[PDB]
Amino acid sequence: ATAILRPIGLHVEKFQQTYRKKWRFLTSANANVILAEAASGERPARWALTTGMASIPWEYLFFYMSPAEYNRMKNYPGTFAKSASVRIRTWNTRVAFQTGDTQTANATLNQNKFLQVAKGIRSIPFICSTNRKYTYSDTEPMQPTGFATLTSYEYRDGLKIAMYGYDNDSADFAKKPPADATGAEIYLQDYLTIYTNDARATTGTKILAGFPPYKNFIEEFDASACINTDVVAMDYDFSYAPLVPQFAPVPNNLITQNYNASYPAGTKNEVTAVKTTDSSQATPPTQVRNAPRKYIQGPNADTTFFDEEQNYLRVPIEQGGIFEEVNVETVHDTQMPSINVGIRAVPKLTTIDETTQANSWLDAQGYFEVDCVLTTESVDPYTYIKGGCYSANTKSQLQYFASDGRPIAKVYDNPNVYGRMQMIKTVKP
Amino acid sequence: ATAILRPIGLHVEKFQQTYRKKWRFLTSANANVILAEAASGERPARWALTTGMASIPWEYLFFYMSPAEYNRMKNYPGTFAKSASVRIRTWNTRVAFQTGDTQTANATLNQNKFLQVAKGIRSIPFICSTNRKYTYSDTEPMQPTGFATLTSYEYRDGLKIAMYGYDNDSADFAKKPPADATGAEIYLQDYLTIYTNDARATTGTKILAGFPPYKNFIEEFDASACINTDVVAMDYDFSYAPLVPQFAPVPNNLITQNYNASYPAGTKNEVTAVKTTDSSQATPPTQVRNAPRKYIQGPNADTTFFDEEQNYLRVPIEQGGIFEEVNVETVHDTQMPSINVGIRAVPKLTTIDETTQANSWLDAQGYFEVDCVLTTESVDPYTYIKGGCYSANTKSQLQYFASDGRPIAKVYDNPNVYGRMQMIKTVKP
Amino acid sequence: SIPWEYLFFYMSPAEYNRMKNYPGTFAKSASVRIRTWNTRVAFQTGDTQTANAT
DNA sequence: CAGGCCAAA
DNA sequence: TCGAA
DNA sequence: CAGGCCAAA
DNA sequence: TCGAA
DNA sequence: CAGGCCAAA
Structure with a gap:
């Protein structure tokens, strides 16, 4: 029989x-030295081991998309980041012909240059590491001598301004010609740092294990043979990266x-849980279901996380585990x-009278060409x-919230806890 | 070596x-009109859109089995409903030659007849619908003008009495000759109804989305070409449909x-949980394990749900998620x-002076032949x-209970919440 | 008249309201298909003096 | 040799 | 399977 | 085109 | 796998 | 025919 109507369903x-960018980054060949970081609040006294391995902030939205693209993206409710791709090519590595010291005839045309690549060090459970910005000595510009006070948020904000420039009415407009327009090189300032405990003032039983052998977790290549070659190619598919909240349903x-x-849930977990651990081992691991949550669209919605534009540069794109959907998830x-x-x-060509590492270095600089692609998807139901x-109410979304009303988000800036990235309260910009 | 004994195990x-019935149902071709349903308690003021799509109560035990079969079934502890099957055939659709109005010469031999089939509309999250019994206007018998006060329980009870008749000592015995004996046609009175919010008195922000386009979720066929043809064939395998509780174990x-x-449960959930959601979004979804439960056989058993014969016509056969077994489930x-x-x-053949739907209809009637089969299984251990x-105690069963002692059961009469059928307290017959 | 020349013939008020969020929207093509069902003709007219039913 | 641990695969 | 095979 | 969401498969 | 593949 | 139940596989 002829069907005058068939179940075509909704119109969706x-x-x-797709968002593409190309960046050219300059890195400094920092010496590996040990810096003391004094105790402060809950932060214990610790030793820090510096490196020249600059952090590549491919986990953040500004790395892939301009302020115009971001501003337009807010007009598409239900936008999810689907995949992110990054490709890193290295160009010729520059090493200074000589150092500033005049007493030593240290200039030499012969070079030994090495490129270091570290993938996934942040998640290694027994290596405590973050990315830090150093202060350097004036006589040895490759030698860190302390820590800059700049936060990770401020570092990424400065990177963003370097990429995309100021507003046309800014008094400081001329100070940062946008690399997205010029294609000029940008200096990176955030470097991988390895920590270990400082037991100088520790009372009772001391842990005297030294450092983890972190060199066993990196790749190091002859930089003379890597000119104009790909060194890193990474692709990531997002689990849950909601960039714009879904359209609200009809309540x-x-x-x-x-x-x-x-209604029954059976033996399935349909509401997520928060896990708290304690490496001091004063308390055992705990798992708590039904955390404080807020809807991010609809009648009582709390859109603070998206109103504050947290996901542009402050928090990573991937937020799986922070959001819930009302369905069987x-x-x-x-x-x-x-x-x-x-x-x-690169050690300076000079003699020293003891069996130690070098104490003086030649200026050296890495040149990295970075391609990045981000793909997203949104729906109009x-x-x-x-x-x-209006969407189906099974598409309704919730976000973890703190009791003071601050949204909770994943952060990658802190060292891993049992190989996990912690979730913390967001801070108002 | 010859074995004088082998582990033959228990005798079970x-x-x-198997239970079969054949029913013939008559349906009225109701007009699609809008009725206002006033606010009452927690029920908000809403608009209702009527249809002629009669509910087929294949989810209930009386649809498949007579009172004698049901009474005998109580003698088999551990009876589970295994599968249910329904087949629907349509016969010739009757449309009135003319309407009651005399002023218009509206009689016509030409007809356009359409059969509507809706499968699974009850579970669609964005369509708020129930089955209702209407009251109709005297001048337009196809036109609903209000809601009858009959409950779903009373409707199904009346259907059951029509199918199987009264007791031989009833004063009303002659009023309902059992269709299970005669094979005569029965009129159905419960029709699919689509609701939307009534914002006439709503203060603040109004939702003015109108109706969902429900026609996009049904099949409609030329009824002139469907005579003596199958239109619906559905099979369902039950997850947990305990009709008679298991034999008690030796305690x-x-x-x-x-x-x-x-003893350890590890990371497995062995006790079920209840999920509560809130479409008003005042509270977020919650999941609670270890709900109030009662054993349904054994020492402290509470058999109220089965003593009251709730599963014959008041609650659906499928009750998965409402019952627990003590094993690793x-x-x-x-x-x-x-x-x-x-x-x-079917619109009356007449002119109207505006671009609207028809306001007068011809009497029309659907004729549906329904085959239904139910298979069950029980054990004597x-x-x-x-x-x-006596069974093994790993076969012991529990049921969700409310704090006042009422058993909790699934119900299909209310609209879905996030695509789910809610569980509510049973009411004593 | 079949008003296939107008936007409401093809799109609901919700679709129209959402479409305003896409600057530079152009209508590209429109298609219409018309099927006829059984034509109904009255058995008789209202006049009683003539036996006109057929 | 990366993504919820690696000494598991 | 909210990577994805 | 139905059974715990569909815009997922 | 308390559908069931 | 044993290991988180057996009358399930």
């Missing part, structure tokens, strides 16, 4: 977008009496692999005939 | 039973000191697909030598 429009409490109904913890690349410090887009 | 007898507290022992939420079939209203059947 899906939109895929069923306006239509139904049973809007606050209950399966959620796991997430983290993107870290990327650090750089040039090993029409559940109802009038009044714009 | 398994019994399979180990009479034999052992460690009857209240504890895996449980998920359940619901059977809904079935609604009917004839579209002999764990012990004397005193009748």
Whole structure:
């Protein structure tokens, strides 16, 4: 029999977008030295071991998309980041012909140059590491002598301004010609740092294990043979990266009496849980279901995380485990692999009278060409005939919140805890 | 070596039973009109859109089995419903030659007849719908003008009495000759109804989305070409449909000191949880393990749900997620697909002076032949030598209970919440 | 008249309201297909003096 | 040799 | 399977 | 085109 | 796998 | 025919 109607279902429009950037980065070949970091609050006294492996911030949205693209993206509710890709090529590595010292005839045409690549060091459970900005000595510019006070947020903000420039009405407009326009090189300042405990003032039983042998977890190549070659190629598929919240549904409490109904979940976990661990071992690991949560669209929505533009440069793109959907969901913890690349410090051609590492270095600089692609997807659903887009309420989203109203998000800036990236309260910009 | 004994194990007898019925149903081709339903308690003011798609109650035990079969089934502890099957055939659709109005010469031999089939509309998250019994206007018998106060329980009870008749000593015996004996046609009165919010008195922000386009989720066929053809064929395998509780085990507290022992569950969920959601979004979704439960056989058993015969016509056959077994179990939420079939209203042959739908209709009637089969299974276990059947205590069953002692069961009469069938307290008959 | 020349013939108020968020929108093509069903003709007219039913 | 541990695969 | 095979 | 969401498969 | 493949 | 139940596989 002829069918005059068939179940065609909803009209839903899906939109895929792609964002590409090309960056050229300059890195300094820092010496590996030990710096003391004094105790401060809950931070214990510790030793820090510096490197020249600059952090590549491929985990953040500004790395892939301009302020104009970001501003336009807010007009597409339900936008999810789907995949991110990065390719790193190295160019010729420059090493100074001589050092500043005049007493030694240290100039030499012969060079030994080495390129260092570290993938996924951030997640190694027994290596405590972060990316830090150093201060350097005036006589030895390759030698860190302390820590800059710049935060990770401020570092990424400065990188973003270098990439995309100021507003046309800024008094400081001329200070940063946008590399997205010129294609000029940008200096990176955030370097992989390895920590270990400082037991000088420790009372009772001391842990005297020294350092982890972190060189056993990096790749090091002859830089003379890597000119104009790819050294890193990484692809990442996001688990849950909601960049713009979904369209709100038509609220069923306006239509139904049973809007606050209950139903079986069986043995399935449909509400996520928060895991807390304690490496001091004063308390055992705990798992708590039904964390404080807020809807991010709809009647009582709290959109602070998206209103504050946290996901542009302050927090990583991947946020799996931080958000919930009201359906029968399966959620796991997430983290993107870290990327650090750089040039090993080049010792100055001179004699020393002891069996030690070098104490003076030649100026050396890495030149890295970075390609990056980000793909996203958004939806325009029409559940109802009038009044714009509305999604099914099974698409409704929630976000972890703290009791003071601050949204909670994943952060990659702190060292891993049991190989995990912690989630912390966001800070208002 | 010759074995004089081998581990033959327990003697367990398994019994399979099959229940068949054939029903012939008459449906009215109701007009699609909008009725206002005023606010009442937690029920908000809403608009209702009527249809002629009659509900087919294939989710209930009385649809498949007579009172004699049901009464006998209570003698088989551990009876589970295994599968249910329904087949629907349509016969010739009757449309009135003319309407009651005399002023218009509206009689015509030409007809356009359409059959509507809706499968699984009940579970669609963005469509708020139930089955309702209407009141109709006297001048337009196809036109609903209000809602009857009959409950779903009373509707199904009346259907059951029509199918199987009264007791031989009833004063009303002659009023309902049983269709199970005569094979005569029965009129159905419960029709699919689509709701949307009524914002006439809403203060603040209004939702003005109108209706969902529900026609995009049904199949509609030329009824002139469907005579004597199958239109619906559905099969359902039950997850957990306990019709009679299992034989009680020999209680180990009479034999052992460690009857209240504890043991690891590991990371597996062995006790089910209740999920509560809130479409008003005042609270986030919550999941609670270890709900109030009662054993349904054994020492402290509460058999109220089965003593009250709730599963015959008041609650659906499928109850997965409502019951637990003491073993290492895996449980998920359940619901059977809904079935609604009917004839579209046939406009009267007349002119109207505006661009609207028809306001007058011809009497029209659907004729549906329904075959239904239900298969069940029960067990007689002999764990012990004397005193009748006893099961292993790993077969012990529990049911969700409310704090006032009412058993909790799934219900299909309310609109879905996030695509789920809610569980509510049962009501004493 | 079949008003296939107008936007409301093809798109709902919700779709129209959402479409305003896409600057540079152009309508590219429009298609219409018309099927006829059974034509109904009255058995008789209202006049009683003539036996006109057929 | 990267993504919820690696000494598991 | 909220990577994905 | 139905059974715990569909815009996922 | 308390559908079931 | 044993290892988180057996009347499930």
